[PDB]
Structure of Triazine hydrolase:
Amino acid sequence: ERMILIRGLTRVITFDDQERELEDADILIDGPKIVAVGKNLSDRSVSRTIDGRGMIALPGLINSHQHLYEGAMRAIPQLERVTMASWLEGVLTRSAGWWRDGKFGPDVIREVARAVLLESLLGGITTVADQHPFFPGATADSYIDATIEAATDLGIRFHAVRSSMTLGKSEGGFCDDLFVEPVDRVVQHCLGLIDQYHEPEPFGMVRIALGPCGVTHDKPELFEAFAQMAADYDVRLHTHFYQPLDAGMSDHLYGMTPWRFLEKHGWASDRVWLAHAVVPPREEIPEFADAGVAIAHLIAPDLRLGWGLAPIREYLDAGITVGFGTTGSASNDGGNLLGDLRLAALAHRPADPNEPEKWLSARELLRMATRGSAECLGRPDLGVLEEGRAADIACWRLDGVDRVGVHDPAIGLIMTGLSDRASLVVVNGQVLVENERPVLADLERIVANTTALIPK
Ligand SMILES: [Zn+2]
């Protein structure tokens, strides 16, 4: 009261239940929450007014699938053109080698996370779900502590997804037994993280989720423990889903499809969101919907790894929640969620060359990146510019020379531009970016410090 007023925004995209948009309108903020969205709001109890003229405001973008530690693994010549098998082997080899050489402990990961998460804020991303699977040694080291610390320092909203690779090469697994933890170690560790960090209240800034790498990378016992843990502590469940080699490997290991696996081990529920979902059998999609599972579309790695086009239109037709994410920077290789939406806008269209009404629109993509992702993460308090939701807001300027001649500013955010840099970004009511610059973080100092720590 002590309120913040963003006045005169040229366009507001709400993604509320009526899909309202507004022009020349205001957003009124008090503490962590939005008070009003509308024309000519009162500045009676306002301590600060921000000039929104020439900007478009959206809900803060929500990256429902990251791997922050991979920020250290960008643009590696040997991984430029690689199929999954070679790629995965190259990432595991590097994370294991750097770690054993003392170059990749929680303290390095903290600063790599700080850089990728600051990038995220600067890209208009106000919540990130990071899935960290790398816990070498005889004790679960403090990598998630490190990412939470970075996220907390920056003030970005954060879901830490505790991942693993519990299926050993012995038992038909992919990875070296250095990455393989006993299921009880993983379960024990997750219990402690929930107790220490999880903020279940509305507008909570740190949440914990439980996330096996996959149906063919983790023991079915882990899936069931997590299903129990999620019901008892009311947290959510995350895993990869229907990557191209999965159906065959699942059949080989278990004689069932990946979806049947999930059903059998307690994961066919509305506690679950699923990464990629590139190549499910079409017949199972109605079952996804009936179960209430959510799907995060990840166009950039699906393309980069040569996997192709997830049936997103089919998911939307079926009423399935669709969110959006970047995955990690070893398979993207950036954290630029907004830019990746352009990739999706365009790459999907050749699959349906004569039915353009099937193509994903700009507004559908922006909805996936905000409300959709919010729903993946089970956050009814995010992803929507309306009274009562979190004051998580991302705004871009529309008056650049590269956006001249744009007729619809929302389509324009996808279809035009030299830069995806946000102008104004608010998280939990706190202004963190203004004039395309961090207001509390030392951008240059963060770059210098993290750069020095990247393994060479
Ligand atoms: Zn992933």
